[PDB]
Design an enzyme around this catalytic site. Sequence first.
Site, PDB file in Angstrom:
ATOM      1  N   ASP A 121       0.502  -1.062   0.032  1.00  0.00           N
ATOM      2  CA  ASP A 121      -0.028   0.318  -0.041  1.00  0.00           C
ATOM      3  C   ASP A 121       0.993   1.488   0.610  1.00  0.00           C
ATOM      4  O   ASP A 121       0.591   2.264   0.185  1.00  0.00           O
ATOM      5  CB  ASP A 121      -0.950   0.072   0.839  1.00  0.00           C
ATOM      6  CG  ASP A 121      -0.473   0.020   2.918  1.00  0.00           C
ATOM      7  OD1 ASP A 121      -0.006   0.634   3.418  1.00  0.00           O
ATOM      8  OD2 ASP A 121       0.128  -1.012   3.072  1.00  0.00           O
TER       9      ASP A 121
ATOM     10  N   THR B 146       2.922   1.063  -7.275  1.00  0.00           N
ATOM     11  CA  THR B 146       2.001   0.455  -8.039  1.00  0.00           C
ATOM     12  C   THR B 146       1.608   2.394  -8.895  1.00  0.00           C
ATOM     13  O   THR B 146       2.047   2.599 -10.446  1.00  0.00           O
ATOM     14  CB  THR B 146       0.736   0.114  -8.850  1.00  0.00           C
ATOM     15  OG1 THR B 146       0.065   0.434  -7.182  1.00  0.00           O
ATOM     16  CG2 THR B 146       0.740  -0.981  -8.110  1.00  0.00           C
TER      17      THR B 146
ATOM     18  N   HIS C 180       8.976 -13.121  -3.095  1.00  0.00           N
ATOM     19  CA  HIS C 180      10.498 -13.553  -2.824  1.00  0.00           C
ATOM     20  C   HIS C 180      10.512 -14.112  -3.693  1.00  0.00           C
ATOM     21  O   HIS C 180      11.467 -14.295  -4.664  1.00  0.00           O
ATOM     22  CB  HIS C 180      10.697 -13.624  -1.917  1.00  0.00           C
ATOM     23  CG  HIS C 180      12.126 -13.986  -1.765  1.00  0.00           C
ATOM     24  ND1 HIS C 180      13.024 -15.096  -1.736  1.00  0.00           N
ATOM     25  CD2 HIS C 180      12.866 -13.212  -1.191  1.00  0.00           C
ATOM     26  CE1 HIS C 180      14.035 -14.687  -1.641  1.00  0.00           C
ATOM     27  NE2 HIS C 180      14.362 -13.767  -0.880  1.00  0.00           N
TER      28      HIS C 180
END
Lengths: 362, 278, 547, 177
Positions: free
Chosen positions: A14, A18, A53
Amino acid sequence: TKPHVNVGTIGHVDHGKTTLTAAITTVLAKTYGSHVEYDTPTRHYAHVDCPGHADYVKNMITGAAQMDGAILVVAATDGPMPQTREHILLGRQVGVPYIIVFLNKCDMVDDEELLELVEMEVRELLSQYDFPGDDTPIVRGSALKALEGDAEWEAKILELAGFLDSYIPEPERAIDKPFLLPIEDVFSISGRGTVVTGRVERGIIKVGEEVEIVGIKETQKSTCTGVEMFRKLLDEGRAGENVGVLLRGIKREEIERGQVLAKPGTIKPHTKFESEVYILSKDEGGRHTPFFKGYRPQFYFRTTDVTGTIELPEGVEMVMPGDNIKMVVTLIHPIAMDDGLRFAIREGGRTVGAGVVAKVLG
Amino acid sequence: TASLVKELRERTGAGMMDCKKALTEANGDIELAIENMRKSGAIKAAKKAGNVAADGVIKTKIDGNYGIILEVNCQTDFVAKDAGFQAFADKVLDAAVAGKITDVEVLKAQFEEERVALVAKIGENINIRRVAALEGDVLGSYQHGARIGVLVAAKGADEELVKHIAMHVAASKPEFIKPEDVSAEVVEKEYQVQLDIAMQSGKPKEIAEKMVEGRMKKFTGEVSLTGQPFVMEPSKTVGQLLKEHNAEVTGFIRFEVGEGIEKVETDFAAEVAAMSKQ
Amino acid sequence: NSLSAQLRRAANTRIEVEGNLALSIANDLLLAYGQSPFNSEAECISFSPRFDGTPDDFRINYLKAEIMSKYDDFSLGIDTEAVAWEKFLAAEAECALTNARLYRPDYSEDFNFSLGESCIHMARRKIAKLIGDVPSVEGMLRHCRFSGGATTTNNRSYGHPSFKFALPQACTPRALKYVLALRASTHFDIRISDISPFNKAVTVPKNSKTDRCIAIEPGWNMFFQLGIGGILRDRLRCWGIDLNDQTINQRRAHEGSVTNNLATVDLSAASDSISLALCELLLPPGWFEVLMDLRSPKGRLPDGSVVTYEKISSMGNGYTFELESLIFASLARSVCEILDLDSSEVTVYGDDIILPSCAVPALREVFKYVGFTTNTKKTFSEGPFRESCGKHYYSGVDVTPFYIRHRIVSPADLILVLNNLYRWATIDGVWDPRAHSVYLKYRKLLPKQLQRNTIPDGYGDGALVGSVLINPFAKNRGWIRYVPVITDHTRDRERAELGSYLYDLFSRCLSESNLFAIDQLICRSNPTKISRSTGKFDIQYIACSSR
Amino acid sequence: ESFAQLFEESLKEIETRPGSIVRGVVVAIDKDVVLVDAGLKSESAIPAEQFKNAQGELEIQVGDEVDVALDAVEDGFGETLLSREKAKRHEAWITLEKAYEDAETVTGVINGKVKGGFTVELNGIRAFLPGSLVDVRPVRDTLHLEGKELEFKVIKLDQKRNNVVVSRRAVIESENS
């Protein structure tokens, strides 16, 4: 004609990764005339985001995206996170040489000194994992404020892009590397002699040069008589080109496929080496049966297969499909190899997985 | 001041501005701040609860002839490797084993006040997925990565034997122990399914019946631990290996992260363009 | 040592019994299903089924009508390839009638000129919209290749592109200008043997009652034809036609099996049916010119007789498949467009077509006008039975049969047949108790080690398909599991060095334009190695997996 | 990329190269014979040239480009061999050449409606006649006859790519003089 740089975003969910890359694309397009790619006035960028990962570990081993640099998105409203250490740790493990940091939502920050706290903490995090935390670029700004069309905020995005060009060097060109070509076929022509065909991987080969044919058999040397494609006979062997190479003094029967024609002393034959590999899952078209210490598959390097045996690292016994593991491979016969080289894992012609050589051994 | 905020944050691990506002509402009082943050943590978790947790870890531990396997899931690959998440999972696991807790809801509600603090600290929705127990005379436990783990109790044999057997279980995903121990409802399910395949293949009553009736014989062995070919020695089945070492298996439990979750897909480029469409 | 040598022995052990083993297997299989056996070699080919009744009956009846049809060792009749030549001469005379008809219409016979001509124009406009005015020389070149079998110069053995680059190939007096340009584009020597309009026409085995007429083109002609056919295939994707994938037509045939909305149409003589005139109309003169250039205008037959082609190209041509596909697509799309139907409903692979049934009566009027004959016992627009691209379906279920095309001698052939029976009579690896007894019975004709040796399905016919986990010959070396199989024994031949080298340089020249998809970029293409087969058999270990 | 360039340019050069004659190179000369390789395994041999005028060492040279005429299997017949297109269509396009450039009324017959208009077959060739150009009065033409021979005058033809737009109303509307 412009260089190509592979980058990516990493950080908390968050924290606006993006939104940040969206801002990048939008501003860069607004100024200068599954993945997203954009352009600077100089070089082109390909941006890839990692959902996890092992996701980008796998993605690194397969050779799909080799990240030259990555930006670390951390919110100033929050600051560093407990999982950020694992982010940077993954940064070291994947071996990304350069990391830039972008502080997001700085507009909502109460005091500059707090931003300095966040900065020093992040730089501490990077310094602990051996990244140049003190010398690493950090750029404050807001992606949300950038997208809305505010120029003062877009300037920070352009600052991040400028740092993205300046801090991350151009990947070494193929020409800049010493000469290597894989040998796919060998011919003996009447009135010409022996010629080996292939696509030159790196470097340049010119007529008269002394080249070294290195591979399965004991490495030997011969001189280039000429270089030619279908259309014309060429003076030079420039990398990336599909050509064939006239050799002097050497017999067709003395050269095998899988051997390489390389600049002398630059490349060496090897047998034992350690590498990080990924094994395909059943739905990915790989084996549905796991393997163990006595695994004896084929290893494809650039041209042909070579049978080899593996040994597993301490702490692991069974290797199931769909996962990545480091392992030590020892071939039955030597193949010319450099570190960072990529190979395929095959059973009877079917690819069950791939790998990348980490550390060459005797 | 800032030097106080850094103190609060270093003491807790809560977000910067969260500590700032907490200290603003607390008039400088530290313990008051940590109290208010402590009571805000619940709703702080409640807002994030809407997110689905695909990733996570499987922890397993044995006490004597008793053993416990557990799945606890988070929403990212990195949190699962975090020290705090690991220590928390280990805490709830050890508490489950030493406490002999076979009820998921109980220890899920037990650690809630800790889990909301761990959530507020981490920033992702984490919760205890599920927990189960197994008891037998000789029980091995195998862990393949943190993603999948298995707990196998059997009588006789040896620790290495049940180790390899556990690995075979983790690899082959057996639903049942012996082909005789198979459920009736399962058998009827596969029976009617394969029969429907047979009848959709344009086959008469008798023919289809006999064919499927023959098929169940192999299916039972395929879904059974005993009938499956041993991973270590594919030349033989598992039951032949048991018969060789003269031992039987009482029970086994296999856990894998993300079972039944379905892991809702996401596209990066599409999201980027979506935000670039505003 | 002895383990592989036992299989090497058993593979070369000739198994022979009285009568026809194929007919014995066929009759015992029919008997297991309670059907009338073939009491003569005639009843094998002469049997015709009826479309009706339970799918289980129809499957075995269709199988009966099929399996022994392609058997070539029948002592029945004097039947020759001469019938195929009669069909050829006839098809050419008819193609001449339709050529002169397309060129100059005689306005009162039949054929509905109104519909036909409108379809012609529409198809021409769509075609022009697809490919363009002139074919790209660049695309042609990048798709230009040597491949396949015999040319008018090299025979079946020398058919390899290496021997094509080594040995001079013939050319058409028109297409000569191409092979000169090529010659000027390289420092290598580009040679032509002779310049002749003629191509060598022969007959490749098809059925017991009739063969198939195949054309053998000059080398360079094929070289460029494969280029334009290549760009045609590349262009047909915009129409939603994948010629590299034939499974779509099969799936849609399965759809037409149940719904019965989608009709399939097959064309036999289509290869010989396509008119020059029809192409001069449907195609822009830009494409028509290179088509006329590259094609063989005349032809020669083993009778010594010559024939000037009314057709553009028959089988054994570079672009003929792609061309007839494109044309059929144009006409059918036009038909569906006139009738206000979705144009994406029609899919064409070669001569195999699938388009909505309501479009059939108009289509059959169009095709009969342009020279394509409609075979009612091939195409099905109504009945529950449908077939396309090698698959046969009846009322939703696949009735697709198998064929024994050769007299069985070696155990390998028996294994081929047994495996076909396996694939036909099994569902997900479960034996139909009827055919199973025939299988088990004829499986005793195999040597013991050739009996008990099993492999998975799709791994080839080198052994009996079954459970490989129970296979005693399965050897686990490393963690990979290997199993031995029958392999045709080959002894190597000398290869042309400059030919293979030229083939290599040309394969490299134009190859500049062509997680899982990326690691396939590591692998390469195989070098030139020439082998000739021997009548004997060999045994080779291969890697295998259950799933 | 340059390969397509050289190929195409050389191709156009060969097309531009007139006659059935082809390029060759003199391998060797003799008193009664000059051998020239045209690119086939059988080299051509010619007796004549000159005797002595300019004839000598400088006249012909090894490695010099010479034009070799071989018509033996060369087909100007192979085209005319197919009698369906050659006689009819050429003269048809000739008549169409007469049609354009001060248009003349030519005989053609409508077949069926295309989209924007109808197709008219005039001799061998096919042409497109616009739908608005059918007649003076724009009555519904669905009831009009198809398959009847009428007269029209050509508007435009592309002469290479085949597209021919013919007007029906040209003779009628422009009738009065």
